[PDB]
Symmetry: C3
Subunit: 112 residues, 3 copies
Amino acid sequence: MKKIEAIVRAEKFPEVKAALEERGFYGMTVTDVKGRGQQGGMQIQFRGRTMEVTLLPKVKLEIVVKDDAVEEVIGLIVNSAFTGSPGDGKIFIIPVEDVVRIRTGERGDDSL
Amino acid sequence: MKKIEAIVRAEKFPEVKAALEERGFYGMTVTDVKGRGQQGGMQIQFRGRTMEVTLLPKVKLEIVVKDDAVEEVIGLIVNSAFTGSPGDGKIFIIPVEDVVRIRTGERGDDSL
Amino acid sequence: MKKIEAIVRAEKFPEVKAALEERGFYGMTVTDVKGRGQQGGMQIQFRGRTMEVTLLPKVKLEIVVKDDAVEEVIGLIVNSAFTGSPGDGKIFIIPVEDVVRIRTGERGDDSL
Ligand SMILES: [Cl-]
Ligand SMILES: [Cl-]
Ligand SMILES: [Cl-]
């Protein structure tokens, strides 16, 4: 089992939740976070000390799937979350040693 | 050392914080998150496109313990967080390679 | 690649963001969390049942760097986040198996 952790745009989150859910992927946990920004104008040049980075609101989705779903889940996120502009987010694959389902006490891939 | 990550009900969080603390487990970090919902009525059937999942407020607790506390911590969470109804949450065991205590610069199991 | 996860003081966060950024470290994701408190007075002794722990607002920063930056990143956080008083926070080193940059589809250390 791997923990998929993707940080995406807020405008693109409904598109990410809709891409995953349509493939039976439920169980995502969502956190409102702040990450690297920028934006447009007409003006002005966003400076800062130190070191000019404006922390802006983004969406963090965490989903724990089986080893064989990982690539399918990755593709679904990149396509739905993509815009082509800098700041579309990142996806991190984090090892998960074991999962425990509270209601049933189930463990392993069955628990998901 | 393992990172325990459990997503529970908000009504059950004081019961989880109270179960852990009574066993000397301090150090938990808590995040307000959203996860899979449902709820009751009398009515109505909660639909949605795509794919009918209502993201609802939950509690995320993260606790970094030594390898030998893991099972004790797991049991304490499942019992306090359990209701028997769908949506009691999940517990993920995530490997933690090393911990650093900022105030002391301590590392390893002593740092916790 | 490792995921650095540090839970620090809110007063010290601008000092942490400024220490990292000055070394080209961008990409941090920030979450408002709650952790172990205490505080001063003149009074009063903060009790509680169970077991007297007051969950207080803190800052969580997550940064995914290459294996060789890990120690440099660790030092920068401890120094900027340190005060000497109990509650300066902790830094956890979590293995990250793979990173995916959404805008480019890049993977590995290049993606960061
Ligand atoms: Cl993780
Ligand atoms: Cl984790
Ligand atoms: Cl982690």
